[model samples]
Target: GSSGSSGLESEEVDLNAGLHGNWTLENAKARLNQYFQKEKIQGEYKYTQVGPDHNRSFIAEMTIYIKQLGRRIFAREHGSNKKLAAQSCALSLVRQLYHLGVIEAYSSGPSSG
Candidate 1:
């Protein structure tokens, strides 16, 4: 009973991290909130649970409410869980904001100090 591999778990997350920035749920939510606040845009994030217990799924929707415009759907996402759904919607909303000129494109400078 001697196996040579015991570190598969470490590589899983590391591989994903290398491809893209790890913008977790709350972190993405915060970024969206900041941009919305700066632009005086009122928005609400809501998550809905769907499917039976054995195969439950989550749906996240981002809605923006303005005085005259009332409400409109900004983004919607579906995932295996609530966090994933919310995180995806939040990140996509950020992308829209950046492309639409509502928020500045996020970039980083030199690091490793």
Candidate 2:
């Protein structure tokens, strides 16, 4: 029996893992918002940009701060517009939290009961 296939072994992926660095700006923001609200955590977001309308395609930078904790999270991403930059910054914050295990995936299994 000849099976015409490349018989390559595929790497196993953890399905229950959340984010794992693969995140879109919008999703990241939504997740962060939910987590923060649920935990009653307060923070501030700051955005900075160099130049103005003349440099339309400049990169956007953002920083997230937690006053009580005195911590700061920073991120930078290029965007064609202000809205896009904001989204990217949000995403960056999400990624930082996720990678640091500040936010993690919740696993659900069949109930024994």
lDDT for residue 87 in candidate 1, whole number 0-100: 74
Q: Estimate every model's Cα lDDT from 0 to 1.
A: 0.63, 0.62
lDDT per residue, candidate 2, 2-93, as tens digits?
Answer: 75877663543454343333456767766766767888776444545556667755466666665544676888877667667767867788
Task: Compose the digit string of candidate 1's lDDT tens values, residues 1-113.
Answer: 77576544332323333335444556666788876778866676678888898987778888553433343338888866676787788877766554554444332222112
Query: Which 10-residue span in candidate 2 carries the lowest summed lDDT?
Result: 104-113
Best by TM-score: 1
* Candidate 1: regions farther than 4 A off: 1-27, 37-41, 65-73, 108-113
Estimated TM-score for each candidate: 0.57, 0.54
lDDT of 2 at 77: 78
